[PDB]
Design a protein around this nucleic acid. Structure first.
Ligand SMILES: [Mg+2]
Ligand SMILES: [Mg+2]
Ligand SMILES: [Mg+2]
Ligand SMILES: [Mg+2]
Ligand SMILES: [Zn+2]
Ligand SMILES: [Zn+2]
Ligand SMILES: [Zn+2]
Ligand SMILES: [Zn+2]
Ligand SMILES: [Zn+2]
Lengths: 447, 34, 285, 55, 38, 149
RNA sequence: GGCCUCCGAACGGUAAGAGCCUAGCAUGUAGAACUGGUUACCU
RNA sequence: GUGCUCGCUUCGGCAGCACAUAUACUAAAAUUGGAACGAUACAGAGAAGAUUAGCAUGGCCCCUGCGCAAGGAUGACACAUUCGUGAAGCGUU
């Protein structure tokens, strides 16, 4: 306790607050006290001027305009008089940048300072160096199945929507994030992720590459589709339309790299002229949503699989569909992939099976080949075949890869890799040493 | 941590204490009695 | 009544007006209502107010608002990395409630001024943290928060705006996230980790260039000093072998019975010892 | 602080009878040292009460 | 200078007390059978 | 392992706590829980379990024996020493505690300690057999004068 | 010589739940780094 | 800011003096994580063979209720054969 006269307290508090010097209160500092306790520059100069006591000298008044009559209206300012004196662009920018960054965390960026190396080359342009050869003949050798996982990759805080390699040979690898992001990777187990892409509002649903390999296409739930420069990250073109766009492909044919084929939730499939950006050809025949589109023979035909439990095969750029396959039995075909020989299709039907449909003119599913060691109740997925058609690898909800022997039609191997459900599984087209998977846990793994 | 809840029962009643009086049978008498 | 405080919070003014609410807020840790104190620290300052109840401070020995130790001004993870992790305290829910209750009775029965069991430990110190402890008050800590209209470019209060107009901290820096509970328990505290990385670089203890060598290469002697300063400093350690002296470059070599003692004299000494009001610097060979 | 009431009275009386006997006798009867027939002595109680109800 | 903060008289009970957490001293020393009896 | 083992522990651990909360006492639940954590070598947990059980019923001599035993099995000599002291202090009349306490000290080699314990024990003026055991203790060493005393 | 009551509301019925998915609701916090050092003698 | 110094002394300025003495959970923001008894889905009321009336008991379970009243499914929760080791203590041949 203490019982200090309130008024003196006010005197000392204001004195210090205003000028910085106030006589110190202490009892036993020396057991006798001679000393001030302030910054003291003011104290020597100002001789302990009290706030209540008049200052010895006055300085530097600042004026505020006033009209006090009150006769005038609007006019009148009272003690409400706004100091006449007081009413960066350089900064105006940093703040904005910060805001943008924040938004992104909830505009494109470049990863790495490597840029163009040696002669002047795209990161995409050449691989040559990795053991083996990307140009490489189609069958590397009698194929192998992996045990050991090499790269986590990460980056994504959400499960990768999709994973795809690179036109020609697996030089680069490209991933789709539901955080509205797309990343490129060495694909050789190398740490570096090349250049990040950003520009979608909502999670990116699917992508496809330019057959030549320079352009790149993405489709997202934001109702937009973008064309990208793989060498700069530049959003070259954006394609409109109200419906959300599901799986999108780029015409494979050398003659018509230009045409986009986009499958829509709203039944239709639409061809887009890239140069015009205009609609070329609508396909209305399908009923219900469209899930996936492949090309059974390049240029000439493609197989669309739809929300209605049917397949529609078509010639290119012609609306009518020549062959329609449905059986009351088959539950659905969320993902369909085409063999490297161009001879077989493989659908992951919801019904927990894999169906082989002959690529050859007769699109008749064959009883001989079937796969049912794995469960996807109702998940989209990728099925791939080991080059040389020796093995088939399915990725499933439970998260365990299923490796089957095509020749012998039997689950040869199985892994419980991933702790969350796994989607796309890709066998490196040139190397038999490995496959690449992705799934909700947000990691890309190599087996 | 004392709650602001109340109850009807709790409210004041009979706040005065009836001390015994002298003819009622105050302790003073009792001490003296045989 | 009256909070527990850092000297750094309380203010740089000796005169202070401080207000009190009976049950103002829940404490963000043991989650009880407790007396809360506000005050203005200074001219441009923020009106700080106690963040945690007095008990859980006495428990981990810390300021109420800062949660930095009383003596060291170090986040708790640090001074635990400095002595004793095994204090602990349940994080989990109803335990926390229970252990707090009991420990509140235990504290009630103490002399009152003592952070419970920790103080039995708290005396033995100085390993590192003294050397990483902060020296002077740090006022940049009480500045008002960053005006969030202006940081979008708009703020329409002009100069009046009590907030602060300047660039914020890039959310990239891991030092950003800083939960309260987290800083309290000493989990993955970014600040505390940074200070740990800073601790390591202290040139100090690895020594041992060569086996058995008790030779001490002493730089920065000075020509005021005598040897007798040395001996009457170093007889604490043990049986000296000898001392070599050079005053031309002012370096003094020393030799002890065991290498252990030489390591010691390094430790105790390095960038710490000063006698004759002049720093006595040490090196190996 | 629930208050005895008409709904609860029969239950109350038998509750505090089971307790009356329990405290009294297990503080009165003992030297079983382990547990002495508390469940059992009370079952003898209810048995006897039924028997007297059936005469 | 300590000052007590003024309370708003129409302010309701701020926070919730109901929560319940389970309930001594070291025991004092106590200082206090035939087969047939058993 | 890493996670799979962990889940097992939650199911057991939680179950143990449920059993205790339901019945409160019935210290076979307390003991079984303690034993399980002991087996997993989580003996700090085990200690807390035993202390909690003691809070419920400090007079139960099986409980104390299991507690001290657990400490001894894990070579925690000084914990065991503490515990023994408590047991004899709060339940002095229980001869089982005294016999075990002296035995432990003898095994440890601390003859002086054991003697001290027995001198404490004798203050309670116990039972013929206790005195015999004290005398015999002395007679395992020569110490005839002590015996006679 | 007189003589004229009342008057209405509440629950006790539409399950009890466990789970999954998705607005809603409270906080307006505390805290954000750190420097300066020598070699010389007998066989 | 108002008034006063037979202030300097004109009516401009300046000086002295008196009076007047410390607002504010500062944000018009930014972030941060528990609940809806929604639908859907699965499943589907204690006691004994069944169908049901209920009062209770216990509290790291609540809700409605002004309530020490009463309700919430009784609110839910409550799961006959036949012995021997090992160690220690005590007395004895
Ligand atoms: Mg009912
Ligand atoms: Mg009923
Ligand atoms: Mg009821
Ligand atoms: Mg009930
Ligand atoms: Zn044609
Ligand atoms: Zn036809
Ligand atoms: Zn707290
Ligand atoms: Zn503080
Ligand atoms: Zn502002």
């Amino acid at each position: 306790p203490a019982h200090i006269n309130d008024f003196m307290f006010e005197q000392q508090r204001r004195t210090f607050a205003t000028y910085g010097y106030a006589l110190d209160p202490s009892l036993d500092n020396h057991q006798v006290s001679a000393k001030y306790i302030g910054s003291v520059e003011e104290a020597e100069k100002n001789q302990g001027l009290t706030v209540f006591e008049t200052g010895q000298k006055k300085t530097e008044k600042r004026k505020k305009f006033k009209e006090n009559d009150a006769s005038n209206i609007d006019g009148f300012l009272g003690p409400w008089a706004k100091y006449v004196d007081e009413k960066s662009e350089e900064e105006q920018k940093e703040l904005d940048e910060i805001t943008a960054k924040r938004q992104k965390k909830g505009k494109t960026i470049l990863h790495v300072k490597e840029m163009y190396d040696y002669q002047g080359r795209s990161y995409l342009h050449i691989p040559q160096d990795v053991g083996v050869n990307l140009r490489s003949t189609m069958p590397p050798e009698k194929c192998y199945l992996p045990k050991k996982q090499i790269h986590v990759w990460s980056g994504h805080t959400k499960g990768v929507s999709a994973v795809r390699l690179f036109p020609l040979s697996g030089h680069l690898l490209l991933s789709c994030s539901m955080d509205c992001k797309i990343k490129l990777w060495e694909v050789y187990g190398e740490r570096r992720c090349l250049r990040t892409f950003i520009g979608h509002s909502k999670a990116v649903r699917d992508i496809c590459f330019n057959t030549a390999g320079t352009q790149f296409l993405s489709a997202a739930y934001d109702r937009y589709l973008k064309l990208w420069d793989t060498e700069t990250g530049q959003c070259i073109s954006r394609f409109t339309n109200r419906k959300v766009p599901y799986c999108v492909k780029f015409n494979p044919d050398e003659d018509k790299q230009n045409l986009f084929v986009a499958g829509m939730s709203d039944k239709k499939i639409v061809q887009w002229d890239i140069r015009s950006g205009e609609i070329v050809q609508e396909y209305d025949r399908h009923l219900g949503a469209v899930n996936t589109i492949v090309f059974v023979d390049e240029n000439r035909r493609f197989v669309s699989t739809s929300d209605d439990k049917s397949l529609r095969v078509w010639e290119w750029d012609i609306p009518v569909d020549f062959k329609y396959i449905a059986e009351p039995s088959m539950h659905s075909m969320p993902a369909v992939t085409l063999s490297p020989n161009g001879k077989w299709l493989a659908c992951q039907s919801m019904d927990n099976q894999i169906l082989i449909f002959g690529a050859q003119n007769r699109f008749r599913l064959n009883k001989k080949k079937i796969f049912k060691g794995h469960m996807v109740a109702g998940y989209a997925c990728q099925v791939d075949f080991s080059p040389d058609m020796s093995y088939v690898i399915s990725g499933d909800g439970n998260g365990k890869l299923n490796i089957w022997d095509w020749k012998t039609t039997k689950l040869y191997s199985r892994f419980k890799a991933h702790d969350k459900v796994c989607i796309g599984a890709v066998w490196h087209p040139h190397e038999t040493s490995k496959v690449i998977t992705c799934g909700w846990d947000g990691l890309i793994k190599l087996w | 941590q004392l709650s602001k809840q109340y109850s009807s029962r709790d409210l004041p009643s009979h706040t005065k204490i009836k001390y015994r009086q002298t003819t009622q049978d105050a302790p003073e008498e009792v001490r003296n009695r045989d | 009544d009256f909070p527990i405080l850092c000297q750094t919070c309380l203010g740089e003014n000796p005169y202070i007006r401080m207000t009190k609410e009976k049950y103002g807020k829940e404490c963000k840790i043991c989650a009880r209502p407790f007396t809360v104190f506000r005050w203005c620290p200074g001219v441009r300052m923020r009106f700080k107010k106690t963040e945690v109840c007095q008990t859980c401070s006495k428990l981990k020995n810390v300021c109420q608002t800062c949660l930095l130790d009383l003596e060291y001004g170090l986040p708790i993870q640090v001074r635990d990395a400095g002595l004793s992790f095994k204090d602990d305290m349940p994080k989990s829910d109803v335990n926390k409630e229970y252990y707090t209750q009991n420990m509140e009775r235990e504290i009630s029965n103490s002399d009152g001024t003592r952070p419970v069991g920790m103080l039995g430990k708290a005396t033995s110190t100085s390993d590192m943290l003294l050397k990483l402890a902060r020296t002077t008050p740090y006022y940049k800590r009480n500045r008002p928060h960053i005006c969030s209209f202006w940081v979008k470019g708009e703020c329409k209060r002009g100069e009046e705006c009590p907030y602060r107009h300047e660039k914020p901290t890039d959310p990239d820096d891991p030092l950003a996230d800083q939960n309260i509970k987290d800083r309290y328990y000493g989990i993955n505290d970014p600040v505390a980790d940074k200070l740990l990385k800073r601790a390591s670089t202290m040139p100090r203890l690895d020594p041992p260039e060569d086996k058995t060598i008790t030779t001490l290469y002493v730089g920065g002697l000075g020509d005021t000093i005598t040897e007798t300063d040395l001996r009457n400093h170093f007889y604490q350690f043990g049986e000296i072998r000898t001392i070599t002296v050079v005053q031309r470059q002012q370096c003094a070599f020393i030799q002890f019975a065991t290498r252990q003692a030489a390591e010691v004299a390094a430790e105790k000494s390095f960038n710490k010892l000063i006698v004759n009001g002049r720093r006595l610097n040490v090196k190996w060979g | 602080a629930k208050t005895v009431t008409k709904q609860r009275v029969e239950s109350h009386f038998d509750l505090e009878l089971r307790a009356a006997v329990m405290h009294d006798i297990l503080d009165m009867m003992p030297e079983g040292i382990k547990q002495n027939k508390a469940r059992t002595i009370l079952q003898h109680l209810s048995e006897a009460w039924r028997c007297w109800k059936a005469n | 200078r300590m000052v007590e903060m003024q309370k708003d008289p129409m302010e309701p009970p701020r926070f919730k007390i109901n929560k319940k957490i389970p309930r001594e001293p070291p025991p004092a020393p106590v200082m206090h059978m035939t087969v047939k009896e058993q | 392992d890493e996670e799979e083992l962990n889940d097992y522990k939650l199911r057991k651990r939680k179950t143990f706590e449920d059993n205790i909360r339901k019945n409160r006492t019935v210290i076979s639940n307390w003991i079984k829980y303690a034993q399980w954590e002991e087996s997993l070598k989580e003996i700090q947990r085990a200690r807390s379990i035993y202390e909690r059980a003691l809070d419920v019923d400090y007079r139960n001599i099986t409980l104390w024996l299991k507690y001290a035993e657990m400490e001894m099995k894990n070579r925690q000599v000084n914990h065991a020493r503490n515990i023994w002291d408590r047991a004899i202090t709060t339940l002095p009349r229980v001869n089982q505690f005294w016999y075990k306490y002296t035995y432990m000290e003898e095994m440890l080699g601390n003859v002086a300690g054991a003697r001290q314990v027995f001198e404490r024990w004798m203050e309670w003026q116990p039972e013929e057999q206790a005195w015999h055991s004290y005398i015999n203790f002395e007679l395992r060493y020569k110490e005839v004068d002590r015996a006679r005393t």
